[PDB]
Structure 1
Amino acid sequence: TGLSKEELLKVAGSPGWVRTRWALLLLFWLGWLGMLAGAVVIIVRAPRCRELPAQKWWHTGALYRIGDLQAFQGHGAGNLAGLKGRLDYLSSLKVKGLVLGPIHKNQKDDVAQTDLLQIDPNFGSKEDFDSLLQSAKKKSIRVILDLTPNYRGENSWFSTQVDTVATKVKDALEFWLQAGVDGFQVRDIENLKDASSFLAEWQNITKGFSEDRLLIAGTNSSDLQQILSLLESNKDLLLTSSYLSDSGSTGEHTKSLVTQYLNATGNRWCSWSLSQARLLTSFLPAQLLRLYQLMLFTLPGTPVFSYGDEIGLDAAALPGQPMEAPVMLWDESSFPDIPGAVSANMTVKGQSEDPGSLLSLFRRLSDQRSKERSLLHGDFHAFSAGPGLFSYIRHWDQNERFLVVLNFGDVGLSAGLQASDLPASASLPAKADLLLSTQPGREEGSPLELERLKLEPHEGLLLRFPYAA
């Protein structure tokens, strides 16, 4: 239904149509070269990516400390081959680490009968130790070993001839690195003479072996200045401390203890922890435990928990047991010495089922901290969001941005966030997706109006929100 070959060539071969056809050909082809130049302009004018920082394993989420292998298990099973069994739990916690409270052969207060190299036979054999350590490698749980020498005694470095004790450690670190451990914790460095110098030597020995091993020192200190002094000469030492411990016991000081410390250290890496050893519940009253798990999982740095923090274990709740090493409550059998005292909700089995439980919050947060590039190594901006609220935004370059809102005071807010004076790079949205709340009865997943939000007393929120160029 048109011109034949004959009819077309008798018309469309005219010089006017030839010039028109040439024009349309070159118009199209310069149009495509124009659209290429347009795209090459956009690709140069576009904001370049921000260099992603090379991160050691301990940046990627929580360590986990096991101060007594016996207390973590119940007796008889209290040995390293027992512990090899439990790693599936730890893998459930998404803990990127472990720290086995000292296993070396220490005789109480005896400098000479103590060895930091031979393991105390109660816990097994080096053949067990390696069996564990190899299993943990297989399951992506690095293992640190705690080498604080006189750990069965009163003073953990002994009272005397400290240079011989330092010499024991200097030898020990080499041996156990050769055995394959992922680094070392030492404790009580306030009871060690010339502490900063020995940390410098031991740190050099560790990093000198491999770049992906760490030394966690730990102090009973809560003085900002003493802490900053141990951290002056040593720059990639985690130093766990009592510094966040003195919280005011309705959280009231925390916005300030946290943001001073970040400011003072110059936003280096940190280890957030309420102590060098004892549980969260040694310090926090139980209305805050949820609120601190939301915070320890989302400040810049590697959080550290003792065992059973994830279930809000408490030494006082099952009377008589020592505040050093309370028996871990796996199921209702786990403390048979006063049977029927353990409620279901106090135990791992009893929490594991319930989305509202503490361990269901720990598990969930541990996920976010270990996957999300924003919590993994984002920047941090505190801001004044509200009267009680410790509030801050974690952000990376262009990834998802996370606003954390902790209501530390005992009075609910009824009038929204009202952020004064946000950094211009990090401005709050009109709305943001509630990724979780510390409290039940919230529409998790849904977007919230920040100017008309309502926190309850001690309700923390984790909101997630997308980028804007």
Structure 2
Amino acid sequence: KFTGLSKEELLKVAGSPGWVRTRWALLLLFWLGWLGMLAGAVVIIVRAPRCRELPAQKWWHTGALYRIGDLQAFQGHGAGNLAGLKGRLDYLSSLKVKGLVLGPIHKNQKDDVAQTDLLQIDPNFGSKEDFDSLLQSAKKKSIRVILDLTPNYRGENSWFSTQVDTVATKVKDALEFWLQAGVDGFQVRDIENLKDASSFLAEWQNITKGFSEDRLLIAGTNSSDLQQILSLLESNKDLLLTSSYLSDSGSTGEHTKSLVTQYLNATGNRWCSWSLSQARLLTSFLPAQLLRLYQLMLFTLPGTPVFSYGDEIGLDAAALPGQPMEAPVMLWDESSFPDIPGAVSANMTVKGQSEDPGSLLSLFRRLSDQRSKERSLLHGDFHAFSAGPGLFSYIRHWDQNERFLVVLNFGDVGLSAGLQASDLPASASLPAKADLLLSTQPGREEGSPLELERLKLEPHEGLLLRFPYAA
């Protein structure tokens, strides 16, 4: 009917010369095609170029640091010990900060130079063993502890203005003692009041790097001029140095662009730190309508962002009655300030800002998550390009990863951007359409890809566009 062949007729018809040659021809053709596709894969593999080697980063290259200068104002009344600080590390890990700068805890009386000792703790903070408990408890949550070792931290002149050699001997012993006890770094402040600054900084940096290479030394100055900042960083180049360099002005955005690009050009794109002060809040220098813009800028510039406590909620020392503005109180809840009761509202607190998805704490938490995981924001290359009158735009790109575009508006007027790039590297040229991660002001929702030619900005707005590696 239509059934197939049996074994006998198949064995008698599939043995003729003409079918045998067809079967051997198809077998040899299949094997040469297999070898051809293997050779094509091998040829394509050795013509894909390369990718560069990671740069083997330290722990302070991977996110922000957090300065807690006054300890008893960080908790409140009574519980201002080193013991009470142990209960805050889950809040600190909510921010994803990689290090912590504990303020000076040693015994200082006043200008008496021979009585202050940098090895022995003032009993108003605790004893020697709950410091050890704090170090281990912070090491479990992946938070490093930096110790401030400024000698005369109770007094107007911060480095004991009469003698210069014995206080350098004090710091030289204290570095060794606390490195053996187990701290992960140091900070010395007000180095413009220290004579022979560049010599002692090199020695202390040497001792700290000689113990281990995952140790840090931070120096702070009140300078704002680039030539002194550069003068302290000639022999030393592994030093993090915090200064008042960006706290001058920025009424116009091209001024801030000039400051950032002039610093990075003058030091040769070395690793730097970005802050507004050596010890002060952002609301000591900026109006409250610029805090989101400056927080987007400080997280997407190539270096280590450094903040004090209360910068993530926008704490203002002049928002309430009398108080030392060098050390305001942190507003955890609405009963955090007992005096002048009822003066603290709910959107001024840590607790009341964690639920609002358009608060300042939420922007800090989103930005500090993106800073510690994206490779083009971890060690990417910075490039700024020209834009409209009053803008600051730049791009961060590493190799073949997701690229980031940041556009910021330091102006009290509406702007259309008009990204006149035309000078970028070929590895980071701009697409026609890019995504969104966030904005500082409401009116947009994120994930929706926007076209970069009629890009319009309302005043005091910053954007976090994003785009993948292509050609």
TM more than 0.5: yes
How far is the alpha carbon of 1:340 from its aligned partner?
1.5
How far is the alpha carbon of 1:415 from its aligned partner?
5.9
2:253, 2:392 within 8 Å by CA — same for their partners in 1? no
- Go from structure 1 to structure 2 and tell me whether the alpha carbon gap of 1:354 and 1:410 turns closer, same or farther (over 3 Å shift): same
How far is the alpha carbon of 1:190 from its aligned partner?
0.6
Once the two structures are superposed, what CA deviation does each residue of 1:165-196 show, in whole Å capped at 9, x if it has no partner?
01100000011011111100110011111111
- Where 2:36 maps in the other structure, the secondary structure is helix
Q: Counterparts of 2:204 and 2:278 in 1: how far apart (Å)? A: 19
Corresponding residue of 2:337: 335
Q: Counterparts of 1:414 and 1:241 in 2: how far apart (Å)? A: 33
How far is the alpha carbon of 1:319 from its aligned partner?
2.5
- Where 1:52 maps in the other structure, the secondary structure is coil
Corresponding residue of 1:41: 43
Once the two structures are superposed, what CA deviation does each residue of 1:26-77 show, in whole Å capped at 9, x if it has no partner?
1111111111111111111113122111000000000000000011111211
Which residues in structure 2 correspond to 1:399-414 (within 5 Å)? 399-414=401-416
How far is the alpha carbon of 1:425 from its aligned partner?
2.1
Once the two structures are superposed, what CA deviation does each residue of 1:320-346 show, in whole Å capped at 9, x if it has no partner?
111211111111111121112111111
2:393, 2:406 within 8 Å by CA — same for their partners in 1? yes
- Greater share of helix residues, 1 or 2? 1
- Go from structure 1 to structure 2 and tell me whether the alpha carbon gap of 1:24 and 1:406 turns closer, same or farther (over 3 Å shift): same
2:225, 2:245 within 8 Å by CA — same for their partners in 1? yes
2:408, 2:461 within 8 Å by CA — same for their partners in 1? yes
- Where 1:239 maps in the other structure, the secondary structure is strand
2:186, 2:216 within 8 Å by CA — same for their partners in 1? yes
How far is the alpha carbon of 1:252 from its aligned partner?
5.2
TM-score by length of 1: 0.98
- Where 1:72 maps in the other structure, the secondary structure is helix
2:254, 2:392 within 8 Å by CA — same for their partners in 1? no
How far is the alpha carbon of 1:421 from its aligned partner?
3.2
1:393, 1:401 within 8 Å by CA — same for their partners in 2? yes
How far is the alpha carbon of 1:250 from its aligned partner?
5.2
1:96, 1:142 within 8 Å by CA — same for their partners in 2? yes
Deviates more, 1:212-221 or 1:444-453: 444-453
Corresponding residue of 1:97: 99
2:388, 2:416 within 8 Å by CA — same for their partners in 1? no
Once the two structures are superposed, what CA deviation does each residue of 1:328-377 show, in whole Å capped at 9, x if it has no partner?
11111111211121111111111111110001100110000011111111
1:385, 1:420 within 8 Å by CA — same for their partners in 2? no
- Where 2:405 maps in the other structure, the secondary structure is strand
1:64, 1:304 within 8 Å by CA — same for their partners in 2? yes
1:249, 1:284 within 8 Å by CA — same for their partners in 2? no
2:386, 2:421 within 8 Å by CA — same for their partners in 1? yes
Once the two structures are superposed, what CA deviation does each residue of 1:108-153 show, in whole Å capped at 9, x if it has no partner?
1111110111011100011111111111001111000000110011
Deviates more, 1:417-426 or 1:343-352: 417-426
How far is the alpha carbon of 1:464 from its aligned partner?
1.3
Q: Counterparts of 1:356 and 1:184 in 2: how far apart (Å)? A: 36
Q: Counterparts of 2:126 and 2:403 in 1: how far apart (Å)? A: 47
How far is the alpha carbon of 1:416 from its aligned partner?
4.6
1:240, 1:276 within 8 Å by CA — same for their partners in 2? yes
How far is the alpha carbon of 1:422 from its aligned partner?
2.8
Choose the corresponding residue for 2:239, options 223, 237, 240.
Answer: 237
Which residues in structure 2 correspond to 1:419-430 (within 5 Å)? 419-430=421-432
Once the two structures are superposed, what CA deviation does each residue of 1:399-451 show, in whole Å capped at 9, x if it has no partner?
11000111112222236544343332211111111101111121211111111
Corresponding residue of 2:277: 275
Q: Counterparts of 2:41 and 2:4 in 1: how far apart (Å)? A: 40
Q: Counterparts of 2:408 and 2:422 in 1: how far apart (Å)? A: 17
TM-score by length of 2: 0.97
- Go from structure 1 to structure 2 and tell me whether the alpha carbon gap of 1:28 and 1:385 turns closer, same or farther (over 3 Å shift): farther
Corresponding residue of 1:389: 391
- Where 1:451 maps in the other structure, the secondary structure is coil
Deviates more, 1:409-418 or 1:141-150: 409-418
Q: Counterparts of 2:414 and 2:138 in 1: how far apart (Å)? A: 44
2:251, 2:410 within 8 Å by CA — same for their partners in 1? no
- Where 2:237 maps in the other structure, the secondary structure is coil
Q: Counterparts of 2:354 and 2:82 in 1: how far apart (Å)? A: 24
2:253, 2:391 within 8 Å by CA — same for their partners in 1? no
Choose the corresponding residue for 1:210, options 190, 200, 212.
Answer: 212
- Where 1:262 maps in the other structure, the secondary structure is helix
Q: Counterparts of 2:431 and 2:293 in 1: how far apart (Å)? A: 23
2:385, 2:420 within 8 Å by CA — same for their partners in 1? no
How many residues are treated as equivalent by the alignment? 469
Percentage of identical aligned residues: 100
Once the two structures are superposed, what CA deviation does each residue of 1:217-256 show, in whole Å capped at 9, x if it has no partner?
1110111011111111111100010011112345552111
Q: Counterparts of 1:390 and 1:319 in 2: how far apart (Å)? A: 37
Task: Determine whether 1:66 maps to 2:68.
Answer: yes
2:376, 2:397 within 8 Å by CA — same for their partners in 1? yes
- Where 2:453 maps in the other structure, the secondary structure is helix
Q: Counterparts of 1:72 and 1:463 in 2: how far apart (Å)? A: 35
Q: Counterparts of 2:142 and 2:258 in 1: how far apart (Å)? A: 35
Q: Counterparts of 2:360 and 2:316 in 1: how far apart (Å)? A: 13
How far is the alpha carbon of 1:107 from its aligned partner?
1.1
Q: Counterparts of 2:433 and 2:254 in 1: how far apart (Å)? A: 27
Choose the corresponding residue for 1:380, options 379, 382, 393.
Answer: 382
Corresponding residue of 1:143: 145
Q: Counterparts of 2:241 and 2:376 in 1: how far apart (Å)? A: 23
Query: What value does the CA root-mean-square deviation take over the aligned residues?
Result: 1.2
Deviates more, 1:251-260 or 1:330-339: 251-260
- Where 1:311 maps in the other structure, the secondary structure is coil
- Go from structure 1 to structure 2 and tell me whether the alpha carbon gap of 1:328 and 1:152 turns closer, same or farther (over 3 Å shift): same
Q: Counterparts of 2:264 and 2:181 in 1: how far apart (Å)? A: 36
2:191, 2:197 within 8 Å by CA — same for their partners in 1? yes
1:404, 1:460 within 8 Å by CA — same for their partners in 2? yes
- Go from structure 1 to structure 2 and tell me whether the alpha carbon gap of 1:72 and 1:415 turns closer, same or farther (over 3 Å shift): closer
Once the two structures are superposed, what CA deviation does each residue of 1:75-111 show, in whole Å capped at 9, x if it has no partner?
2111111111111110001010100110011111111
Deviates more, 1:385-394 or 1:364-373: 385-394
- Go from structure 1 to structure 2 and tell me whether the alpha carbon gap of 1:411 and 1:422 turns closer, same or farther (over 3 Å shift): farther
